[PDB]
Specification:
The protein has six helices and 14 strands. It has about 260 residues and is α+β, with helices and mostly antiparallel strands. The N and C termini lie close together (about 10 Å). It binds magnesium ion (4 copies). The site of one magnesium ion has 5 residues, from β3. One of its GO terms (cellular component) is mitochondrion.
Length: about 260
């Protein structure tokens, strides 16, 4: 696998700051890492994950062979770390700072494991068909709604927001909403890559998702030259369809192994 080929674009939209972060790296000989972080309420939480996620993972790699279990621990461990960082700084806004997290680990070139909290997305495109690797955590999910109430929170409306503040039901940070049911525990998925067909991993933030569905994302990946152009193509298409949030796409090509 080559990382010179990974394509990524991030556009700011009609917002004052761009709070999307993304990273990818070769962690060990066997483990590749890919991530998007959609921040809100200040970039502090997205930056924190961007800065520290790779060490939470690497320190746990020698201890945990189930990568779904590994990322669960890493997410909860990094959220506990952000809590303390926030509670101990002079800036009180860090207590309202949050972020989505969608992280992918590829082991041995073959085993793809994806964990996320929030409404940023991961899909896999093989032969121009998408497969969803994530499901959005939003209050319009019956199971998510029930946890929010069980924990004593509520959902308000313009379109549904937890306690009138948070458009999603899981996240890293948002220290005050943690008691009301906003958790840092991811949902996970494990798959094996195709031995013969080329498959692409695409991470996107909600600015893109609002206007470009999963199928149209495969079309851009399928029809553009390199992943670089495809990533820039799909973020720009979202802006032109009417999206105003920050928009970030990351396109990862996998060889047939
Ligand atoms: Mg890094
Ligand atoms: Mg954002
Ligand atoms: Mg949102
Ligand atoms: Mg967003």
């Amino acid at each position: 696998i080559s990382l010179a080929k990974v394509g990524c674009a991030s556009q700011i939209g009609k917002r004052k700051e761009n709070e999307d972060r993304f990273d990818f790296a070769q962690l060990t000989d066997e483990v590749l890492y890919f991530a998007v972080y959609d921040g809100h309420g200040g970039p502090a939480a997205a930056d924190f994950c961007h800065t520290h996620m790779e060490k939470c993972i690497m320190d746990l790699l020698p201890k945990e062979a189930n990568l779904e279990t590994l990322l669960t621990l890493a997410f909860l461990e990094i959220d506990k770390a952000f809590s303390s960082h926030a509670r101990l700084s002079a800036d009180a806004t860090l207590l309202t700072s949050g972020t989505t997290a969608t992280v992918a680990l590829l082991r041995d070139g073959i085993e793809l494991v994806v964990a996320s909290v929030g409404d940023s997305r991961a899909i896999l495109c093989r032969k121009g068909k998408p497969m969803k690797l994530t499901i959005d955590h939003t209050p319009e999910r019956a199971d998510e709604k029930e946890r929010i109430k069980k924990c004593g929170g509520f959902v308000a409306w313009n379109q549904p927001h937890v306690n009138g503040r948070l458009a999603m039901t899981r996240s890293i940070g948002d220290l005050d909403l943690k008691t009301s049911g906003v958790i840092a525990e991811p949902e996970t998925k494990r798959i094996k890559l195709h031995h013969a067909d080329d498959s692409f991993l695409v991470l996107t933030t909600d600015g893109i998702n609002f206007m470009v569905n999963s199928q149209e994302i495969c079309d851009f990946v399928n029809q553009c030259h390199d992943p670089n152009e495809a990533a820039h193509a799909v973020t720009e298409q979202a802006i032109q369809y009417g999206t105003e949030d920050n928009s970030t796409a990351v396109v990862v090509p996998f060889g047939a192994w």
